[PDB]
Amino acid sequence: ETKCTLKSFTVEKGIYQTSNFRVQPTESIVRFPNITNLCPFDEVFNATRFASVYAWNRKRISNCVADYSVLYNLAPFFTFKCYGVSPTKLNDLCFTNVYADSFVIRGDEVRQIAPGQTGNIADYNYKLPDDFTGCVIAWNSNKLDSKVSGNYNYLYRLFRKSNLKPFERDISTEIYQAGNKPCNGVAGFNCYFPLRSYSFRPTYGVGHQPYRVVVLSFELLHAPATVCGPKKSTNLVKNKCVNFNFNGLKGTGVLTESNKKFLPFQQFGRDIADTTDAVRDPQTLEILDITPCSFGGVSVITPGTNTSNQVAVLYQGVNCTEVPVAIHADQLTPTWRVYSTGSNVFQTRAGCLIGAEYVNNSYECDIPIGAGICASYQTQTKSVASQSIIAYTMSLGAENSVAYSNNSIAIPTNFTISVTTEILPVSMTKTSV
Amino acid sequence: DCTMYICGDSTECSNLLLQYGSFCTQLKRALTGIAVEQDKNTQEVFAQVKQIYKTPPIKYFGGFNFSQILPDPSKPSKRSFIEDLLFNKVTLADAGFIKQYGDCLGDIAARDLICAQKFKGLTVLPPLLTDEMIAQYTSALLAGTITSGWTFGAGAALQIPFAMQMAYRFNGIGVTQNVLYENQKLIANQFNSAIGKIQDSLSSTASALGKLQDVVNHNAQALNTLVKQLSSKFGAISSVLNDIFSRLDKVEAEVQIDRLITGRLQSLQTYVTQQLIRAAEIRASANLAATKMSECVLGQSKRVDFCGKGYHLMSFPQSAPHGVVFLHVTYVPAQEKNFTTA
Amino acid sequence: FSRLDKVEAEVQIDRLITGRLQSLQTYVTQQLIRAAEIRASANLAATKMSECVLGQSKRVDFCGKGYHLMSFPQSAPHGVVFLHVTYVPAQEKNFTTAPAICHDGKAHFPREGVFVSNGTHWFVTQRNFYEPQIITTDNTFVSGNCD
Amino acid sequence: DCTMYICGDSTECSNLLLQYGSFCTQLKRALTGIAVEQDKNTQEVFAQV
Amino acid sequence: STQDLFLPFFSNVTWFHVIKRFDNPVLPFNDGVYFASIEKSNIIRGWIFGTTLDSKTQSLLIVNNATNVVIKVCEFQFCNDPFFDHKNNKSWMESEFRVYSSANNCTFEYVSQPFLMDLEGKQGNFKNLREFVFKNIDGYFKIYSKHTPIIVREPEDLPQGFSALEPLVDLPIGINITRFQTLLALAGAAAYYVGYLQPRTFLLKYNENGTITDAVDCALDPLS
C-alpha cells in the first residue's frame, strides 16, 4: 500500500500516510411506521367524477402504505412526469404530508401543470411553485366521460384580476370587467361571467378530448412520516455498524440509545454540519444517536526497502482494544488483516502501534511516531540474533550534572579549531508556463 | 481524509471523487509538509543543547532566587512555577490525546466540538516533543545558564560562581565589575523583586499570552469554518449527500453531487492554502525564537532592544503551549545627575 | 471535438478548461509560497555572507557552534555552503577562584580575566584560555575597602 | 463588499449568493486581518519611543 | 441563524381590553400575526380569518365551544357582531351561537375536544398567558402556540421574559387571508395583544436540552 501511495517499487526509510481504515457495516436495517393498509389511491383513480379545475379538489392521504406499482398495473392511465424525486425511488422512500390534487383539463394543456409554467389555466385557477416536490399524472377519459351531445359540467376560470398564488383555490362567481366602466350586476359590454366550459365530444381532434389529472404534492425526509412505500421494517439493532434507513433517511453508522429529549413534534436531530446525527425510531418512540462507524488514519513505518520488507503500522487516534474488534470476519477498507495478530501491540499516546516492539532503553529518534515515541530497525539482542522494528521513548541528550560550587571555576588549558559546514538554499528553478 | 470530508460515508460519491484523484493527494502531502515543519521548529528552538544539564542540590546563586523558574520535583509534570502559570493562560483545543470512543459518544457528543470535527475526518496530530520533553530541554538550558553562563553554548559547560558570571555580564554592558560586587545584595534583591512581579502579572491579568492564544484560536476558527462549509449547497438541491442519492437517478444525481464535490474540494484547497500561509508566519516566529535562544540564553547580546528594553544581562527560557516565553534580564540606568563635561 | 456538436462539446470542454485552469492557479500559489520560503533563506544567506565572511560575528551560534573565527563561502547548485571556522575550548581544569584580592585594606579586581588558584598560589588568567600571571598592580585595579 | 462585487446592484443575485454564504465572510475576515497587520507593522517600526 | 416571518423585537403591538367595554374589531392580517391574551376562565374562544367575510369568497373559522372545537373553511356569512353569552355561568350556560347566518360551499372541516387546558391547582388572582402565531404561505395556514401560567402585573402588560412557541397544527386551506377577527364571551376582565410578523434574520440559542432559550433580532440595533 505504501508502494502504490508513493507510486514507487522502492520506499525510503520513514513513516508514511496511507488510506484511512474504515469499518464496513455488518447488516442493513430498515424502519418505517407499522401502517398496514394499502392507501385509498383507487378511491380517486376509479371514481364517479373529478372537480371542475376552477375549484380543484384536494385529498389528504395518510396512515397507510403507498404502492404505486399495483395501481399502475390496474389503471389504464398510461403517463408520468416527476420533479422532486425520480419515479424509480418512489417505492423506496416515505412521505410526511401527502395531498393529491384532482381535476380535469384538455390533453394539450397538460404541460401547464409543470412548475414555473404560465397561460390562463396556470395563471387563474391552478399554480405549482418553483420548488414543487411531487409528480403529475394524466390520462385520456374520452372512453368514459366524453359525450357526443357534450359533457359541459367541466368548467375553468378564463378571467381573473391578477395571477393566483401557488396552491390557492378560487370559487368566487362575481362578474369580471375588461371594459374600463363598472359593468355591475349580471353582464355588460366587454364584461364576463368568469367561468367557461370544454367541448368534450368523442369525435373531436387529439388533445381537445378530456384528460383526468392528479398531482401528488408530498413532503419528505425531514418531518414525522404518515405514508410510506411498501418495503418491510427489520428488527432494530444497536452498538454495531449498519446500513440504516429510517423513513427513507439512508446512511451507514452505529446506532445507540440517546438522552437527547426530542419534543413530540420533532423526528430528526442534526449537527453543526447540517447532517442528521439522531433520529427517533418510527415504530418504538425512543431517540437514537447516529455515529459514523469506527475509522481513522493508517500510517506505515518502514526501514528503507533495500534494508528490509518488515513494517509496523500506526492506527492513529485509535484505542488498541478496538483493533482486535476490527477482526476481518466482516469487510474493512484495508484488506491486509494479518497485522491483527499483534502480540507485540503498544498503545502510544498517538495511536495503536502494531508490529514494532516497545523497549525500555532510549535512543536518538530514527522514525518519529509521535508523543515522545520513535521507532527504528535494529538488532534487539540485549541478552542467534535478528533485526526487527523497535519502538522507544526518545533520548533528549546525554545526562550531565554540572560541578558548580560557590568558589569553583573551570578554565580551558587547550583548544580545538573546528570547521563546520552550513548549507542554505538561495534560489529555486525559474519556471514559465 | 478528503474522502470522508467531501463524500461523508458515501460509496458512490467516493467513485465520482476518483475522476479528480491527484487533487486530494496534493492536500494530504501539503498538510503532512506543515506537520513535519512543526516538529522541526520545536527542535530548532528548544533542542539547542546536546546534553541535559541538572542544577545541583545546593540552590544558592549569590542571593539570586531562581526557585520559581527552575523545575519543582514535587509536581507530577516537571515544569517550573512560571511554566505552570503559562500552561493555564493558554486554553488549548485537543493536544491529539487519543479518544477511546466512549469519550466521543454519549453525553459529550451533545456539546464537544472536537469529536464533531473528528466525525468529519478533520484530525489534530500530536507533537513529537511532549510538554515534559520541552520542560526538560528548558530545564537544561536554564541549569546550563545559571551554573556555567555562555560557556555551555560554545563548548562543554564550564562551571563559574553566579556572582562572577554576573560580573562578566556587567563588563559586557560597559560597567566595571566592581559595581556588581559593591552592590551584590541590592542587585539580587532587585532581580528577586522583578521575578516576583512576573508571577503577579501572570496570576492577575488575562490579556498577556494573547500572541499564543491567537494561534490556537486561528486553528480552531479555520476547522470550525471548514465543518460549517459542509452546510453550503453550492447550487445543488441539498447539502445532505444521502438526500441526493435517495431522490435522483444516476444520470442527474451526478450533476447534483458534482456540485457538492467541486464546492467541498475548493473548501479544502482554501484551508490548505490558508494553513500554508500561517505555517510560513509561524516558521518566521520559530526562526526568531531559535535566534533569541542562541543570542539571549546561550549568550549575552550587544544588539539594542533584541533581548528586551535596556542593556542585556541574561535571559531565561520558559515553555508555553505552542510557544516559548523569554524572561529577559536587563540593566537599566535609573537616577541621573547633570555634570559639566569636556 | 471528434465526437460532439459545438453546442455540447462546449460543456465537455469547459469542464477541462475549468479543471486545468484551477490546476495552474494551484501551482502558481504553491510556487509563490515556496518562493517566499526561499527568499527568507536567501535573506539569511546574504546576512551570513555579510556577518560571517565579510566580518567576524560575536553573535552566539550564528556562524556555527563555538566562538566564530572565519568563514569561507562555497557555491552549490541553487545554494551556498559556508565553511565556518570556530575556536572551541577543549581541555578544562578545575581551579579555586575569588571575586577580589584583599592586599592592604584595599580590594583588587582583575583588569581583564579572572583570579585563580592551583591550591597554594594565586594568579590572574584570561577567561577563555589558561595562561596564569603573577598578581600585580598592572594586572588589576583597586576599588573600595575589603569589608 | 463581496455582494457588491459579485452581484453588482442586483437583488436576486444576492439571494443566489447566500447558497454559498460563509465563502464571502472568509474573504472579509482575511482582508480585515491584513488591514490590522499594517497598523501593527507601523507601530513596530516607528513607535519605538 | 434563520430567516422567517417573526415578530420584530421591541415592536408596538396593538392592545385590546374587555370589561361593559368590548373590543371585537376586524384587523388586517398581512404576512401573519402574533396574537396573545392574558386570560382567566376562558373569555377568548377563537378567530375568524378571510378577505370578504360575507360568503362572496370563503373564510376560515376556529372556535373552542363549551366541550370542544370546530375548525372550518367555507363561504360563511359571518354575523357583523360575533359573540357568545355566559356571564360567568351565573344562572344560564351556552345557548346562542352568534357567529354566522349561513355556511354555503365548505371545503374543509375538523372537530376535536375542549382546546387549551387551564393551570393546575390555582393560586390567588393567578391568571395565565396564551400566545399564538398564525402564518399563511402557499396554501398552508400554520398555527404555533404556547401557554405560560405567570404572576399578574398590574398597570403593566405582556410580561418581560423569553419563551418559544411550539408548532401546533397545519391546515391545507388554500385561501387568501387579508383580515382577521376574535371571538369572545359576554362582566369579564380579559386583555389581548396583536403584532405583525416580518421577514427577519433571527439568531437562536438552543441549550443542551434543545429548547430555544435566547435570541437576537439581527436588524434591531447595531450591537444586535
Ligand SMILES: *[C@@H]1O[C@H](CO)[C@@H](O[C@@H]2O[C@H](CO)[C@@H](O[C@H]3O[C@H](CO)[C@@H](O)[C@H](O)[C@@H]3O)[C@H](O)[C@H]2NC(C)=O)[C@H](O)[C@H]1NC(C)=O
Ligand atoms: C388576495 O386578495 C386581495 C384582495 O382581494 C388582492 O389584492 C387586490 O388586488 C387588486 C388588483 O391589484 C386591487 O385592485 C385595485 O388596485 C389598485 C389599488 O390597490 C387600483 O388602481 C385599482 O383600480 C383597483 O381598485 C385591490 O385593491 C387589492 N386588494 C387588496 C386588499 O390588496 C390580492 O391580489 C389577492 N392575492 C392573491 C394571490 O390572490
Ligand SMILES: *[C@@H]1O[C@H](CO)[C@@H](O[C@@H]2O[C@H](CO)[C@@H](O[C@H]3O[C@H](CO)[C@@H](O)[C@H](O)[C@@H]3O)[C@H](O)[C@H]2NC(C)=O)[C@H](O)[C@H]1NC(C)=O
Ligand atoms: C593541545 O591539543 C593538541 C591536540 O589537538 C595536542 O597535540 C597533540 O599532542 C600529542 C602529544 O602530547 C601528539 O601525540 C603524538 O605525539 C608523537 C607523534 O607526533 C608520538 O610520540 C605519540 O605517540 C603521539 O602519536 C598529537 O599527535 C598532537 N596532535 C596534534 C594535532 O598536533 C597538544 O599537545 C595539546 N597541548 C596542550 C598544551 O595540552
Ligand SMILES: *[C@@H]1O[C@H](CO)[C@@H](O[C@@H]2O[C@H](CO)[C@@H](O[C@H]3O[C@H](CO)[C@@H](O)[C@H](O)[C@@H]3O)[C@H](O)[C@H]2NC(C)=O)[C@H](O)[C@H]1NC(C)=O
Ligand atoms: C525564593 O523566593 C521564594 C518566593 O518568594 C521563597 O519561597 C517562599 O518562602 C516562604 C518562607 O519559607 C514560604 O512561606 C510559607 O512557609 C511555610 C511553608 O509550608 C508555611 O507554613 C508558611 O505559612 C508560609 O506560607 C513561601 O510559601 C514560599 N513560596 C513558595 C512559592 O515556595 C523562597 O524562600 C526564597 N528563597 C530565598 C533563599 O530567599
Ligand SMILES: *[C@@H]1O[C@H](CO)[C@@H](O[C@@H]2O[C@H](CO)[C@@H](O[C@H]3O[C@H](CO)[C@@H](O)[C@H](O)[C@@H]3O)[C@H](O)[C@H]2NC(C)=O)[C@H](O)[C@H]1NC(C)=O
Ligand atoms: C602552584 O603553582 C606555583 C607556580 O608554578 C607552584 O610553585 C612553584 O613551585 C616550584 C617547584 O615545583 C618552585 O621552584 C623553586 O624551588 C626552590 C624554592 O625554594 C628554589 O630554589 C628555586 O629557585 C625555584 O624558585 C617555584 O618557585 C614555585 N613558585 C612560587 C611562586 O613559589 C606550586 O608548586 C603550585 N602548587 C600546586 C599545589 O600545584
Ligand SMILES: *[C@@H]1O[C@H](CO)[C@@H](O[C@@H]2O[C@H](CO)[C@@H](O[C@H]3O[C@H](CO)[C@@H](O)[C@H](O)[C@@H]3O)[C@H](O)[C@H]2NC(C)=O)[C@H](O)[C@H]1NC(C)=O
Ligand atoms: C359545538 O359546536 C359544534 C358546531 O358549531 C357542534 O357540532 C355539531 O354536532 C351535532 C351533533 O353531532 C351535529 O348535528 C348533526 O349530526 C349528524 C350529522 O350527520 C346527524 O345525525 C344529526 O341529525 C345532525 O345533522 C352538527 O352538524 C355539528 N355541527 C358542526 C358544524 O360540526 C358541537 O356538538 C358543539 N359542542 C358543544 C359541546 O356545544
Ligand SMILES: *[C@@H]1O[C@H](CO)[C@@H](O[C@@H]2O[C@H](CO)[C@@H](O[C@H]3O[C@H](CO)[C@@H](O)[C@H](O)[C@@H]3O)[C@H](O)[C@H]2NC(C)=O)[C@H](O)[C@H]1NC(C)=O
Ligand atoms: C435540562 O433538563 C434536565 C431534566 O429536566 C434539567 O435537570 C433538572 O434540573 C433541576 C434544577 O437543577 C433539578 O432539580 C433538583 O435539584 C436538586 C437535586 O439534583 C434538588 O436539591 C432540588 O430540590 C431539585 O429536586 C432536577 O433534579 C434535574 N433533573 C435531572 C434528571 O437531573 C436541567 O436543569 C435542564 N438544563 C437546563 C440548562 O435548564
Ligand SMILES: *[C@@H]1O[C@H](CO[C@@H]2O[C@@H](C)[C@@H](O)[C@@H](O)[C@@H]2O)[C@@H](O[C@@H]2O[C@H](CO)[C@@H](O)[C@H](O)[C@H]2NC(C)=O)[C@H](O)[C@H]1NC(C)=O
Ligand atoms: C539638568 O539641567 C536642566 C536645566 O539646566 C539647569 O538649570 C538650573 C535650574 C540648574 O539646575 C543648572 O545647574 C542647570 O544648568 C534641568 O531642566 C529643568 O528641570 C525642571 C524640573 O526638574 C524644569 O522645571 C525646568 O523647566 C527645566 N529647565 C530646562 C531648561 O529644561 C534638568 O531637570 C536637570 N536634570 C536633572 C537630572 O536634574
Ligand SMILES: *[C@@H]1O[C@H](CO[C@@H]2O[C@@H](C)[C@@H](O)[C@@H](O)[C@@H]2O)[C@@H](O[C@@H]2O[C@H](CO)[C@@H](O)[C@H](O)[C@H]2NC(C)=O)[C@H](O)[C@H]1NC(C)=O
Ligand atoms: C571538577 O570537580 C568535580 C567534583 O569536585 C572534585 O571532587 C574531588 C574528587 C577532587 O577532584 C576535588 O578537587 C574537587 O572538589 C569533578 O566531578 C567528579 O568527576 C568524576 C569523573 O571524573 C565523577 O566520578 C564524580 O562523581 C564527579 N563528582 C561530582 C561531585 O561531580 C569534575 O570531574 C572535575 N572537573 C574536571 C575537569 O576534572
Ligand SMILES: *[C@@H]1O[C@H](CO)[C@@H](O[C@@H]2O[C@H](CO)[C@@H](O)[C@H](O)[C@H]2NC(C)=O)[C@H](O)[C@H]1NC(C)=O
Ligand atoms: C356554491 O354553493 C351554491 C349553493 O349551494 C351553488 O349554487 C347551486 O349549485 C347547484 C349545483 O350546480 C345548482 O343546482 C343550484 O341551482 C345552485 N343554486 C343557486 C341558487 O345558484 C354553487 O354552484 C356553489 N359554487 C361552487 C363553486 O361550488
Ligand SMILES: *[C@@H]1O[C@H](CO)[C@@H](O[C@@H]2O[C@H](CO)[C@@H](O)[C@H](O)[C@H]2NC(C)=O)[C@H](O)[C@H]1NC(C)=O
Ligand atoms: C480502551 O477502551 C477500553 C474500554 O473498552 C478501556 O477499558 C476501560 O478502562 C476503564 C478505566 O480503567 C475501566 O473503568 C473500564 O471498566 C474499562 N472498560 C472495559 C470494558 O475494559 C481502556 O482503558 C481503553 N484504553 C485506552 C488506552 O484508552
Ligand SMILES: *[C@@H]1O[C@H](CO)[C@@H](O)[C@H](O)[C@H]1NC(C)=O
Ligand atoms: C370501478 O369502481 C366501481 C365502483 O365505483 C367498481 O364497481 C368497478 O368494478 C371498478 N372498475 C374497475 C375497472 O376497477
Ligand SMILES: *[C@@H]1O[C@H](CO)[C@@H](O)[C@H](O)[C@H]1NC(C)=O
Ligand atoms: C404494530 O402493529 C400491531 C398491530 O397493528 C401492534 O400490535 C404493534 O404494537 C405495532 N408495533 C409497535 C412497535 O407498536
Ligand SMILES: *[C@@H]1O[C@H](CO)[C@@H](O)[C@H](O)[C@H]1NC(C)=O
Ligand atoms: C540498496 O541496497 C542494494 C542491495 O540490496 C544496493 O545494491 C543499493 O546500492 C542500495 N542503495 C542505497 C541508496 O543504499
Ligand SMILES: *[C@@H]1O[C@H](CO)[C@@H](O)[C@H](O)[C@H]1NC(C)=O
Ligand atoms: C520495563 O522495565 C520494567 C521494570 O522496571 C518491566 O516490568 C517491564 O516489563 C519493562 N517493559 C516492557 C515493555 O517489558
Ligand SMILES: *[C@@H]1O[C@H](CO)[C@@H](O)[C@H](O)[C@H]1NC(C)=O
Ligand atoms: C557556599 O557559601 C555560602 C556563603 O556565601 C554558604 O551559605 C553555603 O552553605 C556554601 N555552600 C557550599 C556548598 O559551599
Ligand SMILES: *[C@@H]1O[C@H](CO)[C@@H](O)[C@H](O)[C@H]1NC(C)=O
Ligand atoms: C411606537 O408607538 C409610539 C406612538 O404611540 C411611537 O412614538 C414610537 O415611535 C413607536 N415605536 C415603534 C418602534 O414603532
